[PDB]
Amino acid sequence: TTFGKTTSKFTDLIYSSRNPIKYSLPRLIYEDLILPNYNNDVDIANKLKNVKFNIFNPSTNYELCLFLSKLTGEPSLNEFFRVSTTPLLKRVIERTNGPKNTDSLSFKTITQELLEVTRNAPSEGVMASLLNVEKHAYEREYLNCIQRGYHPNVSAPPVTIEVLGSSHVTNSINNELFDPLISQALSDIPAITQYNMHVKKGIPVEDFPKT
Amino acid sequence: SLSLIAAHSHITGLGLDENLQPRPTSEGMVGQLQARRAAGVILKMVQNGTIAGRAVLVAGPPSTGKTALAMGVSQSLGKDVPFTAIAGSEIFSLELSKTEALTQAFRKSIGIKIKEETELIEGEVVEIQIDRSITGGHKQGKLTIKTTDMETIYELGNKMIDGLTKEKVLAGDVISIDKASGKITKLGRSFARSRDYDAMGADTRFVQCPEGELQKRKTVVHTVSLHEIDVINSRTQGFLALFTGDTGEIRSEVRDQINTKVAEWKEEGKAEIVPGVLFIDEVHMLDIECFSFINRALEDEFAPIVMMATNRGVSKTRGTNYKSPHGLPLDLLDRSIIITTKSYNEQEIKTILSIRAQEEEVELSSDALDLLTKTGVETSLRYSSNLISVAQQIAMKRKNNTVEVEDVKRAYLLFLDSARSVKYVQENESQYIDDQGNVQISIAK
Amino acid sequence: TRTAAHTHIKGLGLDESGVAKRVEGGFVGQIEAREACGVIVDLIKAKKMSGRAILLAGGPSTGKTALALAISQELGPKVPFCPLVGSELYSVEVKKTETLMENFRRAIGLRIKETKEVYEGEVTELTPEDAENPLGGYGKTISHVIVGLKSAKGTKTLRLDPTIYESIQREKVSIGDVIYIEANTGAVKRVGRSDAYATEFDLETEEYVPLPKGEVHKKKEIVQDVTLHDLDVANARPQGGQDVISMMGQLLKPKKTEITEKLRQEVNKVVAKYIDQGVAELIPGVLFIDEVNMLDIEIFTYLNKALESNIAPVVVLASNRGMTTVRGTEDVISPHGVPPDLIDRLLIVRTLPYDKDEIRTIIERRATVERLQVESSALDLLATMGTETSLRYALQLLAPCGILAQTSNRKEIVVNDVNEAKLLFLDAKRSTKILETSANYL
Amino acid sequence: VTRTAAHTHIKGLGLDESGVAKRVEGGFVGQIEAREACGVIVDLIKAKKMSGRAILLAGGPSTGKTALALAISQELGPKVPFCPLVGSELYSVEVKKTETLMENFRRAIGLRIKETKEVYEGEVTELTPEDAKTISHVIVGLKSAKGTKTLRLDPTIYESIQREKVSIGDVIYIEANTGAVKRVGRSDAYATEFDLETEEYVPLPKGEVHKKKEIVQDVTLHDLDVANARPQGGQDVISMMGQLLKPKKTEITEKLRQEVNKVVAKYIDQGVAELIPGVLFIDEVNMLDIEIFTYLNKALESNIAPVVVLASNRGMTTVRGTEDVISPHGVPPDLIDRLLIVRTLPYDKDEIRTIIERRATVERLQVESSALDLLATMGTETSLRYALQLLAPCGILAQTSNRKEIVVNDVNEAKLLFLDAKRSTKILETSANYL
């Protein structure tokens, strides 16, 4: 790392770790290939490929959406357009187990039926014990009192790409590296902040960011 | 409007009578009387639907009409009956086994029929009034939805509001609601509000306001293949695997469950079984393991009727070291009935050439058609069929409408057969690269 | 009804403590093979031996697959049966050793019995009762939750733990929905809305299920049947968790993976522990591999290893080859295409070809199963043609004969119909003879 | 300044209005019949009615097949799609080869869409949103050097404005049709609010705020095929850093192709789209396996198949993937029945001399007469390509000795320094230890 170090009523410790390797990029490649301007067609082609000629669009392909909703059991016909145009990690994060209608083609497998029973089941039940091999193997071989044998030799942050003379590049890189949704997902909220948000501000629990 | 003229686009159905008797020239097909009668028998076996897992083989010399017979059977099968047409080279995959690829091809050719009743309320939203209780557990709603002719008011529920605040409608959007099932879609925005917001946005689209009755009744019949149910029931979100091909070796237990419960839906009376045809063109390049799996995969009740086409004589079977008739093992040939196709004569070649010129919108003279028929007797039929299309452009360049003998002769001079190319290669062998990589580049000895 | 090359065969046809009679269960002949297969059936029902192999060998069109399905029908629909082709073991996702092991474990079933005490019905009231002395700094200090249930010929009011109230809020349960309360765990779940509240609103989604039958309190004995492979694949994948890896992999392609011997050992010992308690029962079954000459010598070596297991089922192999090189080798001439190491660990059942009368009887039963009426002379011509070319070719030309008979508006198949069907559809010998005398690359 | 690479003196087939070829026109010398046949095929492509037409042009090496295919592409124009390919490119480690052939088939069928571009740019003077916790709309004021224009905006573009951190005094970019918002930077009028700042200061736009422009978009069917078959998901507008999983190619199902076909047909019937079929050219067709050759037969029978052009320089050669199939040009007999064969002839001495003079004048080199005759004699004795590749070292050797023309001594020096295949093989045969 190259970070902000000291050469020697509070102090600030701010995250400043970078990579010593720098990838330098000219402004012209950014401004004429990734950013839209008046002389290029990034946004027009994006709209044409992603909205107009999308085959899950109910404004042009209603029959396919109705066929898929009979297949899957989705209560909304705009679900497939939403799924096909969002990234995978965002789809993992905001996934909610909403109800689906019974008159559909989707089923419950016997593996899923075995899984759903033993979610909250206690010990000494036959199904629960037949479905809990790994936890019994964890608690039999004393794995919460074992020591770590390997640690890595070098730890290194991602390679820093710089573009001289562009605030847009810095904002885009800070948004990608420190995305608030995924950063909140991989952490948790403090309890007193949850109390202040739920009671003192009237935010319901279903409106909390997923953590 | 996304269809051009193909190799056999004139064939639309099998030209048979009500006694399964072929006409000499009807419905696009010329000749081949016994093969057409046998294909009509196979057509009636598929249309009866009480038979399962039967393999037929269409065997003949090249350019005889085997894939023409398959196209005629496909056109006379009618819609909502599955027809899967694969080649033999399509089943060798990098991320799928041959057995699983053959199973997917087998289960793409047999489907079930589901009929459902829809009551749609499609219109433009005027105003939504939301009333909330003190506890807030449940909410009531007012929806004022408007077509061109009629506007009314409905009472919404709590889950109606929970489904409406997702994909948020904003008083002027075209939506539709199913009364029996509760399905919701947002079609877009009306054209009457297209000059309010001055810049569209990424997620918006402008549709026309619907007219007529607000409540409309319409029935819809869906035909779903068994492979689609397999793909849907193998993952959390499996329709992307239907449209991307990343199914990845579906397990056998979900297939057994799907077979059992398709049978119980047939017993209840909600779905009906619709059998179909799987066509494997050029079956001689399949492995011996594929042949064994085909041998044991036809003995299931949910098995289609399989048609195979081969132009090979006694040739080697791939994966082995011996030679067999049609490139197929004798165990597969014992489970088969063979339709034999035979070579044409001059009159049938002339009739096929006239049909292909009529389909391609080309006007030929009598002498030009006679010369093309003579070429099609000497050479093959496809050379004359291609000569029609190039001689049409040769005639158009001369500012003439109908083609003549001169245009056919110019097309014969400019474009060669296989035989003339063989002769011209064989008499100038030193200018070509041989099996040993030898060539004489220079022109001076 | 759909018929496909079988389903005229129901069982073997043996009587009690005796020999097979001539025609019973759809079988015509093969008396010694039926007797040996019946002895194998009693050996499977004895539930004692493990890892026994039986290879039944004979020529093509003799009845090996028929005897395998007859074994499956005679065992019943609770004993597991895994039909398989030797070509199916070659997979591009995992190694063929693990495919054979998965098919091995799929043939052993478990019989588990359990008692469920459950409360269900329409909710009449749902109130959290406040305590006598509330604690400061909080709102809604609950002491118990009073929930009233209503079903057909019953109504009962319950006294619950306060910790059921968070599951009440989690499943979004109001007054009027029908719920499902199991005894030890609590853990309510909303079945749906009652049918008596179906038409309160013009537009709604909550589905409407009927009010349940019977009393609100019932103890039912459920018997759930799974195989050992289902237990393996349920234990291998991680359970319901909140980490990004599990829900990330649920939305991806379910790739097969090499399940270790460790997991199978722990599954085997917990299964034995609950079998010794009397709760469970093990039902071994049949794994049937067809055309075993397609197997490589490495899979044969793994079969040699895997037949030594304690939990192994019976395994039935079928082959039609004579003296053939084993696949994967260049010089091993072996009987039936099976290496001698496996041949020493099995018993061989011989199946003999048929005669004219047996071919005629098989054509007759395949005709009456297909719901066809055949005359006497047409049946004799079909039997003569079956003797001349193939029995399967005679069975393949029954439904074209029926279609050509229905074309002329008759319900009987006669000699000119079978002659026209013979002219329309060729057999292997006539097509080979056409191929041999033609020079147009036919 | 300018680059020359083995072509680009070829500008077209050089035909008249009757389809006849002149001797020297369009960079081609000789080869009248192949150029006339190629013009006929070009007209058949222009007619826009036929699917699955296959033409194989065959002949020895250095005879002009690739130049003829290139001239067909120049005669068709930049609107018509042209997908050049070599036969070795169909083998991939991600998908099967038949899938790759299907993508290359659908890359040769194009569409033309007429679109418009509508852009508001300028300095933000007012950004005031009004509610009814949900905003109804926002009114934005924009300023340029030619005036100010106020706009009403939907909440989605207001959320996009809030994402890009736009305040009062920033020069922004709004496109009307898509709703894209880009922040150019703060304006120079607020450049002296602090002495040192982290913001970049851009000047005002000198034009109007509102700009209108009609554009043409060219896509292919494969672009829509891969836009609708993304397995990982839809990607964001800006992504310097990659996705979490690496997306690989997948076997695109025929159902997705059917849905894309019906959407394109419904857009064609409304006058929004125009269909332009094109050419798939496969050089070195002898590299193809028999499985690809077998799949080509059923691929050419589709209703949306393009015009396929193939080239081969083999004779009676065995086919790859077989052992005992000897067939002309390395092409199996099942596909040569579906083909029309155009022959390509070897050259004479004066044709070689005219080709050398044309390659000299496109490369901006002056040659004497005697050097031209020695280069022609060398071309007839060794190879046509040898003289064309020796033209430029002769120019370098003439530039070294301060001359503007290539003299016989430069040609002799370049022949001494560089060898051909024949002399190198002669050194190879009379040698002791690996040359």
Ligand SMILES: Nc1ncnc2c1ncn2[C@@H]1O[C@H](COP(=O)(O)OP(=O)(O)O)[C@@H](O)[C@H]1O
């Ligand atoms: N009986 C027929 N009637 C009409 N066209 C035919 C007939 N037989 C062959 N053809 C035509 O001949 C051409 C090539 O024949 P094809 O069926 O491809 O040969 P093969 O059976 O070897 O595949 C096709 O365009 C097809 O339309």
Ligand SMILES: Nc1ncnc2c1ncn2[C@@H]1O[C@H](COP(=O)(O)OP(=O)(O)O)[C@@H](O)[C@H]1O
């Ligand atoms: N003993 C028998 N009795 C009745 N039908 C038989 C008998 N043997 C064979 N068959 C029938 O012959 C047909 C083909 O025999 P099959 O069992 O496939 O031969 P293989 O032993 O080669 O698998 C089957 O449809 C089966 O119903």
Ligand SMILES: Nc1ncnc2c1ncn2[C@@H]1O[C@H](COP(=O)(O)OP(=O)(O)O)[C@@H](O)[C@H]1O
């Ligand atoms: N008739 C011609 N007139 C002018 N230049 C030609 C002609 N034929 C070939 N050339 C030139 O000769 C070179 C080799 O020709 P090329 O097309 O590569 O041969 P091939 O047919 O083996 O591909 C190319 O650079 C091309 O520009």
